[PDB]
Structure formats: structure tokens, C-alpha cells
Design a protein around this ligand. Structure first.
Ligand code: FAD
Ligand code: FAD
Lengths: 591, 591
């Protein structure tokens, strides 16, 4: 009963009654504006894990005078699931062009995630637009300074922002020239949007359902749910109800729908057919999430709203964690994997409150302190021996939280053929050989797309083209394959050469055999399940798990505090890790 | 509506109306007694995959005169998910004792799986009892010949059997001396059976639930379901209702419960608490199956009935597929992975009906024939290009069927310490060093167990001890770790040395630190997800998947027929693969 209101508070970043403070305001205050409240006690803090959560918490707590040590199992790299392939001075380069880079993990940051964007700005880092949908490159004006970060609180005309507006900045126009290739037929997204029957009949859709895009189908199925906490305007836009029944509405969403997977919600509640769910699970999101909890899809990484604006970091996503890491060169210990965690909650009495044993990745090493923030995924925590045991429900959450399997395959091309008009294909193909153009004319139209990506039901699933070229380069690296579960597992068990052949072949199925001429022979692969420090992409709740034990996930265990994407309810997002990191830094500062 | 009756028929091995023949009778007739009906057409048959399904189908169809070729991707091994670690004449031995062997895949065969057991007998192979529960070794009489295989049909006093009874054969008495270690407390199974409160309170169980074993909890939750098709006797044993409403009852089980996961069935229908489900998911089966379909647990690999008897093959489970393979040395082509499947359904007209391209594991190889039986898992089929496309629902089943991740870790010991009394620990520990015994007296009681295994919630989960010693050997190989999902993924990403240390340590948590002295330093690991020809343990349906598309799984596509565990509804069992193999052999014999 109160589980439901407390979960909606955790979900909505609402403080305890009766003040009901906006925690995102507090977090932006701390992280961006002030730093932490005057420390008071200066303490010895052990932070486990140098992903974004540990780096944000450690950078806060250190600047407040505490004695901080960050233990990182990886011997060469910080950032965790933020991972960019790029040329390193020791090693060779990942691609044939040493200037080329590409993402292995996080790649896009939404405008509705203010903590992270503001953090990137405060670190003096540059951001460009990330084109979720492919754009018309002769529209808008990106030369202007990026707009500031804006956040509107749920409260009394309370807003937060980063700086002055930049009215001369204009996003390019969505062009939707990219492909949907399902059931061996293929259309531009613009064609699918106006006549969804072309693709939907391929999934054996009939009746009313056939003439809706899967986006519309999904948004119509959700409108009665949105009604719990909001009213649609005259416009019709949505307006949140006043605070109380806005909060009591969300709490009844949790009560009514947490035992639903997204698929059972679509079949039994929205009354959609098997074929409608199959198409939704193919075009919009993935069939990953249909057996996952309803809440994972209504809040995770999905085509949120064409309304939304996305950003990327110039020079790679790694710039965020690696800049924070340089600020913390004295605190970060690399190559030390926590294998044992010992703590005292009223080591031992009088002495240190926490003791952590690490092992190198010089047989063991013991660390001590007063407080600890554990930010490692539960897939890692599972194999740490903890004494005394955690609370029962916390132990169950470690055992029962699943991580999803995801793999990214990246292919380097010497030219950005996805931008080519058929004219450009003529000019550039023949520039290499006498009649290379005529030699191909397995034939597809020219994609001629800037940004965005294509969707398919072959094992490549989602394909993304780089939003922006690497300055001074002539080619680009395509995210050729981004898939989950059994798809990802089969990707992982290929030899490297087989795997890039398969990814290239499936790319040709969409884009045309002739893309092969621009393939440099350089691929990279990231099998997040093969990563011993992640063992997956993100925490994914199955139905009922969130009310079963998520409140126990966030509770501290004596001197041990917890942070990371899995502690938030923004699973699979950077913003969830940054939120819970600030939240933990505030808490261990308190004592 | 008819989907439900046809699924119950597929489930119950009932032929079409109005004859309603017992297919298991037909399969035992064909496979064991006669061989196939006179062929008629002698044809050219391509079989893909040399697991048990392909070997059973090919051995039948060949002995009926057809021209059969079995294409096997693995370059060194047949049997697929039937895999025994053992000494090979080329390679070194898996363990320090070259006589030692242990299972990587299938290990136990139930008496209620007659096709397989009869097949093992007909191949002149030897079987011993597999002790699911640890036994009193001075009870029963295993010297006598094993009892014959008996099957009672659902029909009119129709029974099948293998041979004459063997009344002098007696199974040993269950002793339940093995451990349950959950929530840092530990009890013998015999103690848990009489006073389940000891373990159940560890899971925070209250009230009525606390005094039930999780087995009782599960069986009581299922009694109203069993009522759909059966009536419990006066005894009370269960008796199946007469045929019609026996079949109409099962069809309403499918209608009423297929949209339930096992967990939602326990929480919402049986009305069990979160803690009761947590304990059930820990002791009885695994928390694997709670988000899987209700039907996967009511039929998969689980503590079925203490009633049941299990068998193992002497010399290893590999003896079954490898004996069939020697009968087929001319038909089996090793090291050829199907990458392309082409077929004609009214190559091309007049010519061959099926064409299969393989690649070596001599750049490509093309095979042709009239009919094909594809027995490879859907995780492999996913990456084969098929032209023309399969039926829509068949393509969706390939995309949407999930395979579960399972890993087995095996540890060799020079002695069978799990059998030791404390006396034997004294005599044998001190036989190695002056006061080795006193040196240890991390202390646990002596296990003193023969067969069966122990259950825990640390990452090892289930631990099994060998039912029988290897004749003329003094030690044994323990299945130290058998786990799924995130547990298995973290097991897989350890170095080999780390992984066996972790498995040994968790074994010591249950059995006592002193087992280390008998550890030879030899481990083996099978990560079924890392296996490119399996990519998992077994097909696992999520809720509603069985009615969504399982009838489409079993349908042929022109000249292409399908077989394997996933085609049956006995997922994760050998018997399901043998059933669908016989079924396919019968069908392609028909033309
Ligand atoms: C493929 C992919 C794409 C993504 N795309 C996006 C996106 O577009 N936008 C977005 O917002 N988010 C995205 N994310 C999510 C985002 O990257 C993560 O949620 C976030 O980076 C997780 O941060 P964390 O600190 O919680 O965990 P982690 O990054 O996993 O940090 C944990 C750290 O702890 C270390 N560690 C682990 N075990 C131990 C141990 N035993 N001892 C010591 N150290 C240990 C690890 O080495 C690691 O450095 C994506 C994630 C993936 C996998
Ligand atoms: C850990 C584990 C324990 C088990 N324990 C038991 C048990 O106790 N009792 C029980 O009854 N069952 C058990 N099983 C289940 C049983 O082993 C399987 O269900 C059964 O062996 C599967 O047989 P199959 O022929 O359907 O598939 P497979 O054995 O997988 O056979 C498929 C074959 O096809 C080959 N192949 C794959 N892809 C290609 C390709 N592209 N081209 C060519 N060839 C290809 C593979 O190499 C393999 O040889 C267990 C399974 C596992 C994983």
C-alpha cells in the first residue's frame, strides 16, 4: 500500500512528505552549482567501480575534503559501460583510419536528462546533436552555440537552467529517408509513416490495426494509463494533474500494471493481436522487452517522442568519464577487483567500519574506511563474499536482477555511402574502376541519409549511421549490428572474420551489394555479456520485481551505500547512474 | 479455439480425430520394433545436425533404403547437447585420472521417457540408476538385470514393454543425507522434509506457508489444475478422466494458463507470497523459470515426483549418440555448417527439391536432395539464409524462441569424500600427513552421501555427486556448479583458474574447507551459451508463446521438415528430440 506511493516517489524523484521536494533540483544544485553541503565530518570513503556513478560520487566527495579511494577492476580503462573504440598511443588503432572512433556502449543523451547534459557542459566538453531520425542537412543552423540545459520542475514555477538561450540554434528537419526492411520488403520511414499498410501487412495485420504505425498503436494503448496522473489539454497536449493526484495516480499505475509484462499489457489490456505485438516488437522497440516488465518499456531506451532532442559528445562518449578521471588521478586505483566486502554495523568495533579486499587483474590487497559506495553491477556483486550478510531482500535483489545481453558490431567504411545520391554513387564508384557503377547495376535504391538509422528483422536489427563525420576524415563507422539475447549470443560465438562478413552481408540486404567496395576490412565488436565487469547491458526487471524488492535495492546496509543505473529507475540510462551517485554522495556526507 | 485442442494433442501425443492414436505407441513401434513402414519411394534426404534427433532420423531412414546425408557443423564431435568429457586418444585427458569422465550436457533419463530408454537398450548399451536423491548403499539389489522399459498407453489396456520383468532388482532406499544451504544456514534434506520451518524461516516465510516444504507448496498449488483432466482416487492417487474430457480438460489448461508465467501463477492464482516464491525458486527449481511460461515448469526438468526412477548410461551419455554414429559412418559429414538453405515448393522445377550450402569449420559446398530434415536449434537457424522465406509464423518462431544460458563446472577429486563418515575423514585425512585431521578440526559435518546432490543460493546453485564410482578408480568428479542466466554469464567470464577456485570455495561453504586436500587441480567447464552450435541449453517459451506459434514450429515448409527438442513440447529433454525425429522420419518416408 505504502510500497506503491514510495515507489512512485522513487520513480518521480520526489522527496519525503510533507515537503515533497524535487530531488532533480537538489541534484542539479549539488552536482552543477554548489558542490556538496559543507562536509562536517571528513571521512575515509571507499568507492567501488569507476563507471560514471563512481566517478561522479568520488569527484563530489573529494572536492568536499573527504579521503576517497576508487577501486576499479579494469586494469586499463575507466567509464565502464561508457566505452568508445579509439586509437590509443600504446595499442594499434581500432579502424584503418586512426582518426576514426565509434561507440561500444552509451552513445546518445536526451534533452530530458538534465543532470548528465549539464555535467558535460560544466566539464567544458562539447556536444553535437545526435540524430535519432535522419535529417535534411541543408536545414537548421548548428553553427550557433548549443542551447542551454533547461529543466522544468514539477513544482511552483520552479525552473533550472544552464545559461542564456541560444535562439539562433536550429535543429535540422527530420527527413525520414532511412529504411524499414521487414519480412523481405523494404520502405523508407517517410513512406511507412504515411502508408503503414505497406509494412504492416507483411506482419499479417488486419483491420484497423493495419493503417496505424506501431508508434500510434503504442501511444493509443498508453493513453488510458497516462490518464491516471495527467489530463490531455484542449490542444491536445498532456498536462499533469495537480501534485496530490498526480502522485496518487502514478502510485496506482504501479499498483495496477507492475505485474504486467509489456506484452501481456498489449495483448490483454490494450487488446492487440499477436501480429500487432510482433510488429511492435520488431519496428519500434525489440521483442526483448515484451516479456520484461511493463515499466521497463514505458521508461527505458525506446523511441520516446519525436518531440525529443538528443546529444552526443564530440571526441566520443569516453570524454565524459575520462575527464572526470583526470580530476581524480590520485584517488583511482586501477586493476583491483573487489572480491570480499566486510563491514561493521551496530572489520570490528572501534576500528574501521568497512574493509574491502581486492585481487589484481600483490596476491590480495585490503582497504579500510568509514563508509563505502558500491557502484558495481549486481552481476559482479553476486560473486563478492559479504560479511555480515545483507538484508534478505537486498540479497534476493542481487540474485534475481537480470542483465540483458547486448552486442554491437561496428564496420568502417572509407566513404559515407549512406549519404550518396545515385549521382554520387555514379561519380564515386566509377572514380575507382572503369565501369564499377554499371558493374553492379542485390540492387537497392540509394539510401541518401544523414544521421538516424535503419530497422530490420534480420539479425543485424538496428543499424545506425554517424550523425556527424569525423572532422577532416572522408569515411565513417557504421553501427552495423545492435541486437540482443539469442541474436547477440550467436554474434558473439562467430570468429571475428565470420562476424564482420555476416554483419556486412545483412547490411547489403538493406543498402545494396555495392557498399562492399567501401568496406575497409576493419571491424570492432563489443559483447557486453562477455565483459566480466558488466555481464550485460543493463538491469531489466521482469514483472512484479519492482514492487517485490526495488525499495530494498536502494537501502544502505550499515556503512555500505549503493549507486549505479540499477539503483535508479532509469535503467539502461546514464542519467540513472548520475542521479543515484549524487544521491549517495549527499548521504555519505551526512554521517 | 481449435488451437487449444490441437496443442493438447501435440502435448499428449494424440493422433488426429477420430482415431486418436497414441503416437508414443507408434514411435516405439517404429523406432524399437519394426523400423519404418516399407519405404516405397527411395529418396535423397538431407539431414542437418548430428545431435540425437538427426542421428535417430538418419539411422531410421537409412535402414529403410533412402539415400541419407547428415551434415554436422562440429568438426570433431557428434551428439550436440549430449556431451561427455572423457579421454580422447589424440588429445590429453580432461582430468588427472584418464579413466575419469563427467557430463557436459544431458546426464539423466527418466523411466517415464520410454523411447529413449528402449533405444539405449536396443543399442546394447548398459544403464545404471541415476540417484536424483542420495541413497543408502546397503539397501536394494542392483546386481540383478535392470527392469525392462514399460509404457502404459492412455488407451484400452494397451501397454508396451521391452522385455520380461526383473523382480529381483531393487532400487536403494532414499536417505536424503545431502544438504540445503540457503541464507547462510544449512540442513540435511531429511531434516528439511520433517521440519521445513528451519530453512523456510530463512526466506522470511510466515504462517501456514512456513511448515510446508516447497514441494508440498507447489503440489498443492497444482491440484486444482490437475483437476481439469484428472480425478484423485480414494487413495489418494490421481486417475485420468475418460478420454474425451481428459483431452478437453488439458485443452482448457492451455486456454486458461498459457498466458501465465510460473511466477504469476504462484502469486496471483495460488495466492503465494513473494517469500514463498523466492524459496520455491531457490530450493525446488531455479528462479530461471518463474518468468518463463507456466507450461515450461509443469513439464520441464524439475523434481517431478519422488515416485520417479532415473537412469544413466555406463561409460557416459555420449555412448548413445556415438553408437548411433558408428552405424552411420558413411552418411555423416563432419565439419560442414549449413549457411544457406534453398528449396522448391509448388533449387528449381524438375531438378532437386532442396539445396543446402555448407561452409567448412572447400570454401563452400552444395548439397541437393528431395527432402530435408532440419534439426539444428533455432539459435543456429536464425543465421541461415532461407529462400524462399518460410511461412510468417515459422519465421517469427525462429526469431522469438529464446534459449536459456546454462554452465556446468566439474571438479575432480582423488577420493569420494562426499561418502566419508567422520571416521573415514579421520582415517583418510591422517593417511596423508601427521595431524591433517586435527589441523582442520569453515568446519562442516561429514556429508556421508551416495548419489543425489546439494542445493544452495550461492552461485554454485546445484551440486551433484556421481551416482556410481568409475570402476577401478578411487576418486570422482563432482558437478560443483550448475547455474543459469547472470550466474552462468559471470562463471563464463572468469579465467579458468579463477573459475575453479570460485567453484571449489563455494563447495567448501557447504561441505567444509578440508575437501581441498582431495582436489586434483583438474576442472572442466561447459558454457552452453559460448557453444556456437547451441547458444544455450534449451528452448524456453515465455508466456503465450506456445499458443502464439508452436503449431507453426512443427509444420513442414515444402520439402523441409523440422525435428529437435524445440519442435517437441518436452523442451530440455532427450525424449522430445527422439519423438520429433521419429515423427519426421515417418513423414519424409511418406512423400
Ligand atoms: C550498449 C549500451 C548502450 C547504451 N546507450 C546508452 C545511451 O545511448 N544513453 C544512455 O543514457 N545510457 C546508455 N547506456 C547505459 C549507460 O552506459 C549505463 O547505464 C551507465 O554507463 C552505467 O554506469 P554505472 O556506473 O551504473 O555502471 P558501470 O558503467 O558498469 O560501472 C561499473 C564499474 O565497476 C567496475 N567493476 C565491476 N565489478 C567490479 C569489481 N568486482 N571490483 C571493482 N570494480 C568493479 C567495472 O569495471 C566498471 O568500471 C548504454 C549501455 C549499453 C550497455
Ligand atoms: C546442460 C544440459 C543438461 C541436460 N540434461 C538433460 C537430462 O538430464 N536429460 C534429458 O533428457 N535431456 C537433457 N538435456 C537436453 C538434451 O541434451 C537435449 O534436449 C537434446 O540432446 C537436444 O538434441 P537435438 O538433436 O534436438 O539438438 P542438438 O543436440 O543441439 O543437436 C543439433 C546439432 O546440430 C549441429 N548444428 C548446429 N548448427 C548447425 C549448422 N548451422 N549446420 C550444421 N550443423 C549444425 C550441432 O553441432 C549439433 O550437433 C540437457 C541439456 C543441457 C544443455
Amino acid at each position: 500500500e505504502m510500497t506503491y506511493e514510495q515507489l512512485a516517489r522513487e520513480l518521480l524523484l520526489v522527496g519525503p512528505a510533507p515537503t515533497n521536494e524535487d530531488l532533480k533540483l537538489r541534484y542539479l544544485d549539488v552536482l552543477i552549482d554548489n558542490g556538496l553541503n559543507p562536509p562536517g565530518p571528513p571521512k575515509r570513503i571507499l568507492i567501488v567501480g569507476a563507471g560514471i556513478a563512481g566517478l561522479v560520487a568520488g569527484d563530489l566527495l573529494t572536492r568536499a575534503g573527504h579521503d576517497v579511494t576508487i577501486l576499479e577492476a579494469n586494469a586499463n580503462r575507466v567509464g565502464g559501460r561508457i566505452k568508445t573504440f579509439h586509437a590509443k598511443k600504446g595499442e594499434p588503432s581500432p579502424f584503418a583510419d586512426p582518426a576514426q572512433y565509434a561507440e561500444a556502449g552509451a552513445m546518445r543523451l536526451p534533452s530530458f536528462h538534465p543532470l548528465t547534459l549539464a555535467l558535460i557542459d560544466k566539464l567544458g566538453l562539447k556536444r553535437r546533436l545526435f540524430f535519432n531520425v535522419d535529417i535534411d542537412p541543408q536545414t537548421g543552423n548548428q553553427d550557433a552555440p548549443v542551447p542551454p540545459v533547461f529543466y522544468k520542475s514539477f513544482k511552483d514555477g520552479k525552473t533550472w537552467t544552464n545559461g542564456a538561450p541560444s535562439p539562433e540554434f536550429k535543429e535540422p528537419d527530420k527527413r525520414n529517408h532511412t529504411w524499414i526492411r521487414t519480412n523481405r520488403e523494404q520502405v523508407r520511414r517517410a513512406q511507412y509513416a504515411t502508408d503503414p499498410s505497406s509494412i504492416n501487412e507483411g506482419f499479417h495485420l488486419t483491420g484497423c490495426e493495419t493503417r496505424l504505425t506501431v508508434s500510434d498503436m503504442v501511444n493509443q494503448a498508453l493513453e488510458p494509463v497516462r490518464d491516471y496522473y495527467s489530463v490531455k489539454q484542449d490542444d491536445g497536449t498532456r498536462v499533469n494533474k495537480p501534485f496530490k493526484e498526480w502522485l496518487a495516480g502514478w502510485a496506482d499505475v504501479v499498483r495496477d500494471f507492475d505485474g504486467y509484462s509489456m506484452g501481456r499489457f498489449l495483448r490483454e489490456y490494450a487488446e492487440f493481436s499477436d501480429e500487432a505485438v510482433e510488429a511492435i516488437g520488431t519496428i519500434e522497440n525489440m521483442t526483448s522487452e515484451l516479456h520484461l516488465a511493463f515499466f521497463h518499456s514505458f521508461l527505458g531506451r525506446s523511441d520516446i517522442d519525436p518531440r525529443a532532442t538528443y546529444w552526443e559528445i564530440e571526441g566520443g562518449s569516453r570524454m565524459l568519464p575520462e575527464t572526470l578521471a583526470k580530476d581524480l588521478r590520485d584517488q583511482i586505483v586501477m586493476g583491483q577487483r573487489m572480491v570480499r566486502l566486510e563491514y561493521y554495523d551496530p572489520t570490528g568495533p572501534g576500528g574501521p567500519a568497512v574493509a574491502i579486499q581486492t585481487v589484481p587483474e600483490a596476491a590480495t590487497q585490503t582497504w579500510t574506511g568509514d563508509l563505502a559506495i558500491v557502484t558495481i553491477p549486481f552481476s559482479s556483486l553476486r560473486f563478492v563474499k559479504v560479511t555480515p550478510p545483507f538484508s534478505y531482500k537486498k540479497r534476493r535483489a542481487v540474485i534475481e536482477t537480470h542483465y540483458d545481453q547486448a552486442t554491437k558490431v561496428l564496420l568502417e567504411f572509407s566513404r559515407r555511402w549512406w549519404e550518396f545520391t545515385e549521382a554520387d554513387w555514379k561519380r564515386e564508384l566509377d572514380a575507382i574502376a572503369p565501369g564499377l557503377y554499371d558493374y553492379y547495376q542485390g540492387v537497392r535504391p540509394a539510401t541518401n541519409a544523414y544521421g538516424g538509422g535503419s530497422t530490420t528483422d534480420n539479425p543485424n536489427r538496428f543499424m545506425y549511421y554517424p550523425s556527424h563525420p569525423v572532422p577532416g576524415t572522408q569515411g565513417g563507422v557504421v553501427l552495423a549490428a545492435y541486437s540482443w539475447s539469442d541474436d547477440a549470443a550467436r554474434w558473439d560465438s562467430f570468429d571475428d572474420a565470420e562476424r564482420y562478413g555476416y554483419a556486412l552481408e545483412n547490411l547489403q540486404s538493406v543498402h545494396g551489394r555495392r557498399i562492399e567496395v567501401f568496406y575497409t576490412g576493419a571491424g570492432q565488436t563489443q559483447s557486453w555479456l562477455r565483459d566480466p565487469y558488466a555481464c550485460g547491458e543493463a538491469a531489466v526487471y521482469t514483472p512484479h520485481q519492482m514492487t517485490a524488492f526495488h525499495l530494498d535495492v536502494v537501502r544502505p546496509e550499515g556503512p555500505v551505500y549503493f549507486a549505479g543505473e540499477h539503483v535508479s529507475l532509469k535503467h539502461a540510462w546514464i542519467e540513472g547512474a548520475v542521479e543515484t551517485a549524487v544521491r549517495a554522495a549527499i548521504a555519505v556526507n551526512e554521517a
